[PDB]
Amino acid sequence: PPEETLSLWKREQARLKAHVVDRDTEAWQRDPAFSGLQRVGGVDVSFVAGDSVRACASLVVLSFPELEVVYEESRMVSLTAPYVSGFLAFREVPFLLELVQQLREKEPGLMPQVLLVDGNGVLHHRGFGVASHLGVLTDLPCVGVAKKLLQVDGLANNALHKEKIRLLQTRGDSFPLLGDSGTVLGMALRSHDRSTRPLYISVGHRMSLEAAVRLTSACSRFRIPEPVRQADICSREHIRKSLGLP
Ligand code: NA
Ligand code: NA
Numbered sequence: 001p002p003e004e005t006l007s008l009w010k011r012e013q014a015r016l017k018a019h020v021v022d023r024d025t026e027a028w029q030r031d032p033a034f035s036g037l038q039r040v041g042g043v044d045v046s047f048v049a050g051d052s053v054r055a056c057a058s059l060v061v062l063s064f065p066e067l068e069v070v071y072e073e074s075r076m077v078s079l080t081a082p083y084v085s086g087f088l089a090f091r092e093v094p095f096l097l098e099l100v101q102q103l104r105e106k107e108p109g110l111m112p113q114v115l116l117v118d119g120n121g122v123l124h125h126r127g128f129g130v131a132s133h134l135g136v137l138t139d140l141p142c143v144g145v146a147k148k149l150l151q152v153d154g155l156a157n158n159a160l161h162k163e164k165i166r167l168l169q170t171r172g173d174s175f176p177l178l179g180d181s182g183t184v185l186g187m188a189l190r191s192h193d194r195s196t197r198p199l200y201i202s203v204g205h206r207m208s209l210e211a212a213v214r215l216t217s218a219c220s221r222f223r224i225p226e227p228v229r230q231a232d233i234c235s236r237e238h239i240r241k242s243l244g245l246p
Contacts, residue, residue, distance in 0.1 A: 001082035009087050010126070017128040019136045021206045026141065028113065029211045033065075040064045040219060041112030042227025043099070043134070045092045046235040047079075048243065055079050056235040056242075057095040059103065060227060061112045067219065067226040071110045073099055074238035086125035089133035100138050114141040114207065116219065116227045123177065123186035123202035125152050135205025142204030143212040144186070145228050149200050154180025164188070165198060172217045174201075187213045191220040199225075 028036035041061045048054040054076065061071040079091040104111055119130035121144030129150075135142030149157050155177055164175045168190040177186045177200070186202035187209060201213050219225040224232070239245070 001084065005082070006084060006087070009084075009090055013087075013126050013128045013133070016133060016136045017126070020122070020128070020132050020203075022122070022203050022208070023206075024208045024211050025206045026113070029141070029207060029215075034215065034218060037064045037113055037215075039070065039110065039112045040067075040215075040227050041100075041115040041140075042118075042225070042229070042231040043096050043115055044118050044228065044231035044235045045077075045079075045095065046232065046239065048239055052083060053078050053080060056238045057092070057099060058231040058234040058238065059096065059099040060230045060234060061103070061110050062219075062227050062230065065218065067221060069230055071103065071107065072230070072234050073102065074234045075099065076238065076242050088119070089128075089130040092119075092130055093133050093137060096134055097137055100140070112140065114143065114215065115204070116143050116145050116216065116225055117204060118145060118147075118228050118232065120144040120146045120150055120200070121186075121202040121204035123150055123152065123155075123200065125150075127185075129202070129204075131202070131204030139206075141206040143207060143216060144200075144202040144204050145216055145225055146186075146200040146202070147224075149177075149188075152179075153183070153185060155185065161188075165196065168196070168198060171220065172214075174198075174213050174217075177202075184209065189213050189216055191217060191225065192223040195223040197223070199223075
């Protein structure tokens with residue numbers, strides 16, 4: 001894309017990042033068992049294999065703590081914004097925001113109290129990933145749940161990182177991800193007793209990192225937390241139906 005587009009995207013990230021709230025704002029977030037939390041949402045965008053434009057965007061809502069799907073919606077979309085590392089949210093957030101608003105008007109009684117986002121929050125090139133960008137615009141508590149480590153602010157998958165993973169033992173075990181300067185950007189979380197590869201959790205909006213990590217653990221029946229896993233499944237199924245794939 002033109003340099004003017006990146007410059008204005010950077011400025012919009014800065015505008016919105018100033019609205020990120022990196023503390024807990026709801027009583028349910030400050031309770032050990034999340035008393036008062038009833039619905040947790042999950043979001044996904046998945047590209048059609050062999051394509052960088054056509055994709056499926058999905059929103060699911062699950063009951064908590066039962067983790068049963070109570071709402072699901074998937075839509076095929078065309079991601080026409082250019083792809084630039086550090087700016088993925090500009091491709092994906094428009095469609096996820098539209099799904100949340102459709103829910104808010106169609107069935108407000110099913111609105112999630114928090115979203116688990118397949119993507120990063122403040123652990124990001126500019127401290128403002130998809131989870132933070134979606135969180136600020138929806139004004140919903142949002143957690144970034146990433147399956148791989150984004151190597152930003154001096155973070156690296158190095159010998160130290162691998163030894164810290166070795167010392168993770170069970171579901172719920174976690175260690176902090178410290179930016180080169182001293183800002184903790186997220187946590188690596190072992191989400192399942194039988195998997196060694198952690199998830200990388202960071203604040204999106206309106207949650208503390210400690211609470212976000214605990215919520216992600218509470219939502220994990222398998223390695224991928226249930227709201228994220230169900231949104232991924234919904235997108236894959238919708239693509240296969242829409243394109244007639246066996
Ligand atoms: Na509950
Ligand atoms: Na271990």
